[PDB]
From Swiss-Prot:
Lineage: Eukaryota, Metazoa, Chordata, Craniata, Vertebrata
Native organism: Homo sapiens (Human)
Protein name, UniProt field: Matrix metalloproteinase-9
Glycosylated sites: N11, N18
Gene: MMP9
UniProt modification remark: Processing of the precursor yields different active forms of 64, 67 and 82 kDa. Sequentially processing by MMP3 yields the 82 kDa matrix metalloproteinase-9.
Residues of the full protein shown: 110 to 444 of 707
UniProt induction comment: Activated by 4-aminophenylmercuric acetate and phorbol ester. Up-regulated by ARHGEF4, SPATA13 and APC via the JNK signaling pathway in colorectal tumor cells. (Microbial infection) Expression induced by M.bovis MPB83 (at protein level).
Length: 160
Protein backbone atom coordinates (compact mmCIF):
# COMPACT_ATOMS: atom_id res chain seq x y z
CA UNK A 1 0.00 0.00 0.00
CA UNK A 2 3.05 2.30 0.24
CA UNK A 3 3.55 4.56 -2.76
CA UNK A 4 6.24 7.24 -3.38
CA UNK A 5 8.44 6.77 -6.42
CA UNK A 6 11.70 5.79 -4.77
CA UNK A 7 14.74 3.58 -5.19
CA UNK A 8 14.24 0.09 -3.71
CA UNK A 9 17.92 -0.52 -3.19
CA UNK A 10 20.21 1.57 -0.97
CA UNK A 11 23.44 1.64 -3.01
CA UNK A 12 22.66 3.95 -5.89
CA UNK A 13 25.13 4.24 -8.74
CA UNK A 14 25.82 7.17 -11.01
CA UNK A 15 27.59 7.77 -14.32
CA UNK A 16 28.93 11.08 -15.58
CA UNK A 17 28.24 10.43 -19.25
CA UNK A 18 29.81 13.62 -20.56
CA UNK A 19 31.28 16.95 -19.54
CA UNK A 20 30.52 20.60 -20.08
CA UNK A 21 33.58 22.45 -21.33
CA UNK A 22 32.92 25.23 -18.80
CA UNK A 23 34.94 23.57 -16.03
CA UNK A 24 37.82 21.11 -15.72
CA UNK A 25 36.62 17.50 -15.61
CA UNK A 26 38.02 16.99 -12.11
CA UNK A 27 36.08 20.04 -10.85
CA UNK A 28 32.88 18.67 -12.43
CA UNK A 29 33.52 15.26 -10.88
CA UNK A 30 34.05 16.89 -7.50
CA UNK A 31 30.93 19.07 -7.78
CA UNK A 32 28.72 16.05 -8.37
CA UNK A 33 30.46 14.04 -5.64
CA UNK A 34 29.86 16.92 -3.22
CA UNK A 35 26.20 17.16 -4.21
CA UNK A 36 25.71 13.42 -3.54
CA UNK A 37 27.58 13.67 -0.22
CA UNK A 38 25.07 16.32 0.93
CA UNK A 39 22.31 13.75 0.63
CA UNK A 40 24.39 10.71 1.66
CA UNK A 41 25.10 12.13 5.14
CA UNK A 42 21.44 12.25 6.16
CA UNK A 43 20.17 9.02 4.54
CA UNK A 44 20.96 5.28 4.64
CA UNK A 45 21.58 5.55 0.88
CA UNK A 46 25.10 5.38 -0.56
CA UNK A 47 26.27 6.79 -3.87
CA UNK A 48 28.87 5.03 -5.99
CA UNK A 49 30.32 6.65 -9.10
CA UNK A 50 30.69 4.16 -11.93
CA UNK A 51 31.70 4.18 -15.55
CA UNK A 52 28.69 2.37 -17.00
CA UNK A 53 25.55 3.06 -19.06
CA UNK A 54 23.82 0.84 -16.49
CA UNK A 55 24.21 3.30 -13.61
CA UNK A 56 20.99 4.23 -11.79
CA UNK A 57 21.52 7.96 -12.20
CA UNK A 58 22.99 8.84 -15.59
CA UNK A 59 24.26 12.42 -15.72
CA UNK A 60 24.31 14.28 -19.02
CA UNK A 61 24.99 17.81 -20.28
CA UNK A 62 22.87 18.77 -23.30
CA UNK A 63 21.25 21.64 -25.20
CA UNK A 64 17.79 22.18 -26.68
CA UNK A 65 16.22 18.85 -27.66
CA UNK A 66 18.57 16.18 -26.33
CA UNK A 67 16.47 13.04 -26.52
CA UNK A 68 13.71 13.02 -23.90
CA UNK A 69 11.04 15.43 -25.08
CA UNK A 70 11.88 17.97 -22.43
CA UNK A 71 14.03 20.31 -24.52
CA UNK A 72 16.25 22.85 -22.82
CA UNK A 73 15.64 26.51 -23.69
CA UNK A 74 18.99 28.20 -24.31
CA UNK A 75 20.59 30.62 -21.85
CA UNK A 76 18.86 31.12 -18.48
CA UNK A 77 15.31 29.96 -17.84
CA UNK A 78 15.46 26.18 -17.34
CA UNK A 79 18.81 25.10 -15.91
CA UNK A 80 18.49 21.35 -15.51
CA UNK A 81 16.00 18.56 -14.91
CA UNK A 82 15.85 15.07 -13.42
CA UNK A 83 13.52 12.10 -13.53
CA UNK A 84 12.17 10.35 -10.42
CA UNK A 85 13.48 6.91 -9.40
CA UNK A 86 12.83 4.11 -11.91
CA UNK A 87 14.55 2.23 -14.76
CA UNK A 88 16.30 3.58 -17.85
CA UNK A 89 15.82 7.34 -18.29
CA UNK A 90 14.09 7.42 -14.92
CA UNK A 91 16.47 8.64 -12.21
CA UNK A 92 18.66 10.48 -14.73
CA UNK A 93 19.78 14.11 -14.34
CA UNK A 94 20.40 16.47 -17.27
CA UNK A 95 22.06 19.89 -17.24
CA UNK A 96 21.54 22.67 -19.78
CA UNK A 97 24.94 23.33 -21.33
CA UNK A 98 23.67 26.57 -22.83
CA UNK A 99 24.22 27.80 -19.27
CA UNK A 100 27.62 28.89 -18.06
CA UNK A 101 28.53 26.32 -15.38
CA UNK A 102 30.86 27.43 -12.60
CA UNK A 103 31.10 27.25 -8.81
CA UNK A 104 28.57 30.09 -8.74
CA UNK A 105 30.93 32.90 -7.72
CA UNK A 106 31.32 35.85 -10.09
CA UNK A 107 29.49 34.46 -13.12
CA UNK A 108 27.27 31.56 -14.16
CA UNK A 109 25.33 29.03 -12.12
CA UNK A 110 26.78 26.81 -9.41
CA UNK A 111 26.97 23.29 -10.82
CA UNK A 112 27.17 22.03 -7.21
CA UNK A 113 23.96 23.74 -6.06
CA UNK A 114 21.98 22.89 -9.20
CA UNK A 115 23.12 19.27 -9.08
CA UNK A 116 22.25 18.95 -5.39
CA UNK A 117 18.74 20.13 -6.26
CA UNK A 118 18.48 17.78 -9.27
CA UNK A 119 19.72 14.83 -7.23
CA UNK A 120 16.91 15.52 -4.78
CA UNK A 121 14.50 14.94 -7.68
CA UNK A 122 16.44 11.86 -8.83
CA UNK A 123 16.00 10.43 -5.34
CA UNK A 124 12.24 11.08 -5.35
CA UNK A 125 11.78 14.53 -3.80
CA UNK A 126 9.28 17.10 -5.02
CA UNK A 127 9.55 20.86 -4.52
CA UNK A 128 9.58 22.67 -1.19
CA UNK A 129 7.55 25.78 -0.41
CA UNK A 130 10.24 26.93 2.04
CA UNK A 131 12.27 29.66 0.27
CA UNK A 132 15.39 28.66 2.22
CA UNK A 133 15.24 24.97 1.24
CA UNK A 134 17.42 23.33 -1.41
CA UNK A 135 14.29 21.91 -3.03
CA UNK A 136 12.67 25.35 -3.36
CA UNK A 137 12.15 25.75 -7.12
CA UNK A 138 14.38 28.79 -7.52
CA UNK A 139 18.10 29.18 -7.86
CA UNK A 140 19.81 31.43 -5.35
CA UNK A 141 23.58 31.33 -5.07
CA UNK A 142 24.72 30.73 -1.52
CA UNK A 143 28.06 29.91 0.06
CA UNK A 144 26.40 28.55 3.17
CA UNK A 145 24.71 25.21 3.97
CA UNK A 146 22.06 24.35 1.36
CA UNK A 147 19.95 21.83 3.33
CA UNK A 148 16.89 22.98 5.32
CA UNK A 149 14.91 20.84 7.79
CA UNK A 150 12.33 20.40 5.03
CA UNK A 151 14.89 18.85 2.64
CA UNK A 152 16.18 16.43 5.28
CA UNK A 153 12.61 15.60 6.36
CA UNK A 154 11.68 14.81 2.76
CA UNK A 155 14.57 12.44 2.08
CA UNK A 156 14.27 10.73 5.47
CA UNK A 157 10.54 10.28 4.94
CA UNK A 158 11.43 8.30 1.80
CA UNK A 159 14.44 6.29 3.00
CA UNK A 160 14.66 6.36 6.79
CA1 LIG B 1 24.44 7.54 3.28
CA1 LIG C 1 18.35 27.30 -20.03
CA1 LIG D 1 18.35 5.88 -14.83
CA1 LIG E 1 27.71 25.64 -20.82
ZN1 LIG F 1 16.67 15.89 -20.43
ZN1 LIG G 1 13.33 21.30 -9.15
Amino acid sequence: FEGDLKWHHHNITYWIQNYSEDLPRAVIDDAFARAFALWSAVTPLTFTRVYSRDADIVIQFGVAEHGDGYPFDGKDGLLAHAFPPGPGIQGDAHFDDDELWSLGKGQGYSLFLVAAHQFGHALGLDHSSVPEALMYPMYRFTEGPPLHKDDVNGIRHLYG
